[PDB]
């Protein structure tokens, strides 16, 4: 910026290595020297994808019979299948669909180790009592979602034409669950754990007969003794049955074989792209790297081979082969710069010129912009390492000189 504020000169910081140097010093005037700059990034030339392809995730049990009460929720656990949320959701009139610790876009598109679906009858009038912040009966004694896993909660009404789902006589829930200790003085509330059933489920019937019904069981010494007690309460049944659906997903306890259904192309195979930098998605595991055919190591049944830094370094493919996975290694770049001549050369340290006057191979890597002179210096200002020196021509190209 000039004194009058106009921009008369600028540097495009990503244009080349010299431009990167000026931007890192925020100056159009930098000193002579040999500077490390951003590496030349390798870019993917393709992608590889492997997913379980087969049976779809079966939501049939959900659609048949009378759904359970909130404290008796039924659980469907999906592994090794192709899931489709729309195919479930389209059957219901969805009133509420919110997600936590996972985006809305992700819940329908990501691969999971498992997907757990908890379904039950639930009055929409008690919507707020399924909130994580709730301190009412439902979150305390009936149903609570996990805090450690990503979850979604869906509340939906069963359409009049979905005649395979029948209604209970009323909605019901536990409003009290506690233990009376053997002293018969102290009462201890028994709170439901996330993703678990309340301990009072064994004393509370599938439907609470009347609001205020009280239940009790004598506990054995093995159970700590004392009594387990509970009270139930009810909500009048609505015109159409209202249901809650809790979805919990896990991302890495197994091969993430719970995926969206993907139509595969033969340009996303590993064998067809060996030696290339590709993006990969292997049963939910993703990143960038280079696949190579190599000797099998690790346990075959476990599919993914990791190193000591927890990087994926090997993979057993469904094609029967074992591949080594290397990162898409970048090419080192150093700028050799002469302030007096305003000239420069690029050093690709530890790189053979096979990957780069043209390129010149030196003991410290490949240089571009230096001319081999078979000249000796003692007074070196731009040492390249070993006993090499960049020697400005003064302007022309920098010469590659040896230090005597």
């Amino acid at each position: 910026f000039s004194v009058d504020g106009y921009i008369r000169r600028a540097i495009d910081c990503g244009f080349n290595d010299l431009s990167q140097l000026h931007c890192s010093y925020e100056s159009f005037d930098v000193e002579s020297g040999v500077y490390s700059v951003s590496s030349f990034e390798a870019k993917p030339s393709g992608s590889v994808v492997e997913q379980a392809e087969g049976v779809e995730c079966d939501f049939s049990p959900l659609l048949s019979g009378t759904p359970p009460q909130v404290y008796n929720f039924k659980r469907l656990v999906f592994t090794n299948c192709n899931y489709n949320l729309t195919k479930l959701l389209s059957l219901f009139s969805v009133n509420d669909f919110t997600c936590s610790q996972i985006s809305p876009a992700a819940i329908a598109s990501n691969c999971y180790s498992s997907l757990i679906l908890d379904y039950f009858s639930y009055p929409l009038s008690m919507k707020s009592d399924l909130s994580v912040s709730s301190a009412g009966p439902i979150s305390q004694f009936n149903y609570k979602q996990s805090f450690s896993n990503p979850t979604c909660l869906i509340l939906a009404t069963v359409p009049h034409n979905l005649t395979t789902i029948t209604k209970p006589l009323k909605y019901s829930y536990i409003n009290k669950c506690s233990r009376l200790l053997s002293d018969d003085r102290t009462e201890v509330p028994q709170l439901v754990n996330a993703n678990q059933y309340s301990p009072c489920v064994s004393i509370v019937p599938s439907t609470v007969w009347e609001d205020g019904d009280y239940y009790r069981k004598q506990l054995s010494p093995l159970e700590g003794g004392g009594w387990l007690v509970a009270s139930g309460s009810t909500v009048a049944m609505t015109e159409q049955l209202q249901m809650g659906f809790g979805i919990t997903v896990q991302y890495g306890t197994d091969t993430n074989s719970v995926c969206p259904k993907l139509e595969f192309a033969n340009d996303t195979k590993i064998a067809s792209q060996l030696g290339n930098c590709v993006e990969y998605s292997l049963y939910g595991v993703s990143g960038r790297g280079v696949f190579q055919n190599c000797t099998a190591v690790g346990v075959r049944q476990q599919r993914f081979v990791y190193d000591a830094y927890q990087n994926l370094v090997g993979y057993y493919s469904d094609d029967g082969n074992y591949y080594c996975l290397r990162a898409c290694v970048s090419v080192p770049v150093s700028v050799i710069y002469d302030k007096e001549t305003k000239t420069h050369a690029t050093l690709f340290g530890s790189v053979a010129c096979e990957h780069i006057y043209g390129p010149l191979q030196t003991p410290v890597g490949c240089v571009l912009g230096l001319v081999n002179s078979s000249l000796f210096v003692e007074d070196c200002k731009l040492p390249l390492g070993q006993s090499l020196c960049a020697l400005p021509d003064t302007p022309g190209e920098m010469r590659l000189a040896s230090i005597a």
Partner: protein, 137 residues
Amino acid sequence: GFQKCEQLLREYGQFCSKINQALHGANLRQDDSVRNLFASVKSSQSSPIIPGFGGDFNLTLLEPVARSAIEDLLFDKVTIADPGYMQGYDDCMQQGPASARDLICAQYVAGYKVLPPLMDVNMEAAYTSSLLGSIAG
């Protein structure tokens, strides 16, 4: 390489400029240290080392074989990972990591680079060789 992260990284000011400049300065200091040290070990005058140097005194382990025998033994007995100054980039693609936790192949993965020393081996040997030949006189 994630643009979203880079956007957030910018909120920390010129962080990477400070990292790069600090290491650049440290690396220059190392080259100045070497240049200064060897300028002082350097003899102004020295006798040629010939086989038999030492006479009755057996100094053959100090004579250049070039590095001396004791010097080669010192290096051979120390476990040093080869940084691959000329083509380590390629060695780590064609052969891969030498072992678990290979910190040389990690260079091109983690985003760091080991730089070569100011002097090569033959030049360093030349300085200690000429130093040896100067001791008696």
